Model the fold of this input.
Amino acid sequence: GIVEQCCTSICSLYQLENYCN
Amino acid sequence: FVNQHLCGSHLVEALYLVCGERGFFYPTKT
Done:
């Protein structure tokens, strides 16, 4: 999941915002 | 820009708020 892969300083807000469903 | 999420509830809460609540809705919750 992007959360586990982005887990760090900044999590790709673009990836989360672009994640959607 | 850059943020410092805590990774756990904030990171996921962001995906829901960013746009993880519209396509994340489910029929009959509990």
